[PDB]
Write a protein that binds this ligand. Structure first.
Ligand SMILES: CN(C)c1ccc(C(=O)NCCCCCCC(=O)NO)cc1
Ligand SMILES: [K+]
Ligand SMILES: [K+]
Ligand SMILES: [Zn+2]
Length: 364
């Protein structure tokens, strides 16, 4: 029926106290609210994830250590480095409750999908795709995307994970790399020295999960038209070969022109065409956020995509609201691609697609 929107004022406040995206959650919700899109959705308060729900993926030793160091924010504990806590993922005070709130919000969205409350459920504070079962990684302490998929596996027999973040969704792919019940598809920048360094087209999963991982390595400067051509080509073949019953879609906005990552050169319109293509499958769909470090452009992107989900065309002027002064110098919703080259050679892209086409022939 109506798409579910995972939201509460306390959840956004909890998300807002995050070292890496300060006030991002407030800016996203407040722009969505300023366009009145929340009136067209079913607002659902997130439950926080129990220990047993987090342990569907993460080990008990990791969870208990995260819980301990989160007490005083002790970031000198001797075992922290063994769990990936330190540089990118400091053991700050309250980090465990913060991670459990976000994980629980993604689980809540998945539970809404199982219960038939909706066919699209949105958590614009989720998508933390780097965390492994026993190790934090790339600013991710818990892998809410994995937790969401595992919740959807209570009902759905084949789940398609699509990861459109700038970065390779290595934590999700690693979680499911030995199984054929969950297919992972990631489009991402892949370049020697670019985080996390995995996800070449030759990485196709392991064992019984061989060919149930799809990786599309892409180079700097890609724009909307070519990105959609790649994405539609891959998802068309994946949908035919895999026949998913549900979809989890990670829509990190660090691909968008103006992001400090300064890598891809996308606008939300291009990401929106990929989203529209997945939406016409009419499957249960769990929508997650991800990266995005130009805060106004990130709000622009996820608001526009919320309008796409609702089939609404939005006014170009950013409406008057709390963060209006952040949308300069132009104060419009549309984003202009930067003037810099697309480094993607058409023949390399086509060779990549041919490989994936061959890998997918093996798919059942
Ligand atoms: C301005 N400054 C001090 C830095 C800016 C960026 C990074 C970085 O990319 N580090 C590598 C870890 C990247 C994690 C990416 C998170 C993400 O968006 N995943 O999808 C480091 C320092
Ligand atoms: K990705
Ligand atoms: K897999
Ligand atoms: Zn990213």
């Amino acid at each position: 029926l109506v798409p579910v929107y995972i939201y509460s004022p306390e959840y956004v406040s909890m998300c807002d106290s995050l070292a890496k995206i300060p006030k991002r959650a407030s800016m996203v919700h407040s722009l969505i609210e300023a366009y009145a899109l929340h009136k067209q959705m079913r607002i659902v308060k997130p439950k926080v994830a129990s220990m047993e729900e987090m342990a569907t993926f993460h080990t008990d030793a990791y969870l208990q250590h995260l819980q301990k160091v989160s007490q005083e924010g002790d970031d000198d504990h001797p075992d922290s480095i063994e769990y990936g806590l330190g540089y990118d993922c400091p053991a700050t005070e309250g980090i465990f409750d913060y991670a459990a709130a976000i994980g629980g919000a993604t689980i809540t969205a998945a539970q809404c999908l199982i219960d038939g409350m909706c066919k699209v459920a949105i958590n614009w504070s989720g998508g933390w795709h780097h965390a492994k079962k026993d190790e934090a990684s790339g600013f991710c302490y818990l892998n809410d995307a994995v937790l969401g998929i595992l919740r959807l596996r209570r009902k759905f027999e084949r789940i398609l994970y699509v990861d459109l973040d700038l970065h390779h969704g290595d934590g999700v792919e690693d979680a499911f790399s030995f199984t054929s019940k969950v297919m992972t598809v990631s489009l991402h920048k892949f370049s020697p020295g670019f985080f996390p360094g995995t996800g070449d087209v030759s990485d196709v999963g392991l064992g019984k999960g061989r060919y149930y991982s799809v990786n599309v390595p892409i180079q700097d400067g890609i724009q909307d038209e070519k990105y959609y051509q790649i994405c539609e080509s891959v998802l068309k073949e994946v949908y035919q070969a895999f026949n998913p019953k549900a979809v989890v879609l990670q829509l990190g906005a660090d691909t968008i022109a103006g992001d400090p990552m300064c890598s891809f050169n996308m606008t939300p319109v291009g990401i929106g065409k990929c989203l529209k293509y997945i939406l016409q499958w009419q499957l249960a769909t769990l929508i997650l956020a991800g990266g995005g470090y130009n805060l106004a452009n990130t709000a622009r992107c996820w608001t526009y995509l919320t309008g796409v989900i609702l089939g609404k065309t939005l006014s170009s002027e950013i409406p008057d609201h709390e963060f209006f002064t952040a949308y300069g110098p132009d104060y419009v919703l549309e984003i202009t691609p930067s003037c810099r080259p697309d480094r993607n050679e058409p023949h390399r892209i086509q060779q990549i697609l041919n490989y994936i086409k061959g890998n997918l022939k093996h798919v059942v």
